[PDB]
DNA sequence: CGTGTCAGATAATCTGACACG
DNA sequence: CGTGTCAGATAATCTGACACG
């Protein structure tokens, strides 16, 4: 009942910039890097999931201390 | 721990049109009618809350059967 | 008395290439 | 090898007035 409401693509890239402190440039750099694949809009926007937002914070925490992308 | 994550204004009027079947014209008609007050963006957009989305469905159910606005 | 649709704005997001300590 | 910022597009949202069975 949890892996359905969260994994549903609901937010655009704006609100997720508010939750995190990540810049659209950071959040979209991780897309063409091979570790996050959020849904697309009818207008080719990016829908992020509630658990995908947690995944963008999984990276946020693995980057305030420091780490590359090939490692994660 | 529930009346904080929900009541936080997070969605714009687009995603809430997806959850409901309500048109932006309906969702914004209820604003200038005196029964819903969602937050504004820096760009003067409308942030809806997760419990505000429930309130827009409270109206959705009180309108498939039929009812005015002065009553609710 | 509730909602579709228009037309002209403004904010938000797209991809592409360039910049740099 | 990760991110700011640019410039020109397109989708998304604003307010205002008009339409109608």
Numbering used by the authors:
A (entry chain A), B (entry chain A): 2 to 73
What are the paper's exact sentences on this?
In Gram-positive bacteria, nitrogen homeostasis is controlled by an operon encoding glutamine synthetase (GS), a dodecameric machine that assimilates ammonium into glutamine, and the GlnR repressor. GS generates glutamine from glutamate, ATP, and ammonium by a mechanism that involves the initial phosphorylation of the γ-carboxyl group of glutamate by ATP and the subsequent incorporation of ammonium.
The Lm and Sa GlnRs form comparable dimers to the Bs GlnR and dock on the DNA similarly. As observed in the Bs structure, both DNA sites bound by Sa and Lm GlnR are bent inward but the DNA from the Lm complex is slightly less bent (~21°) compared to the Sa and Bs structures (~25°). However, GlnR proteins contain different wing residues, which our structures show make distinct contacts to the minor groove; wing residues Bs Arg46 and Sa Lys48 make nonspecific base contacts in the minor groove, but the corresponding Lm GlnR residue, His47, makes hydrophobic contacts to a ribose. The lack of minor groove base contacts by Lm GlnR may explain the slightly reduced DNA bend observed in this structure as the minor groove base contacts by Bs Arg46 and Sa Lys48 are facilitated by the more bent DNA conformation.
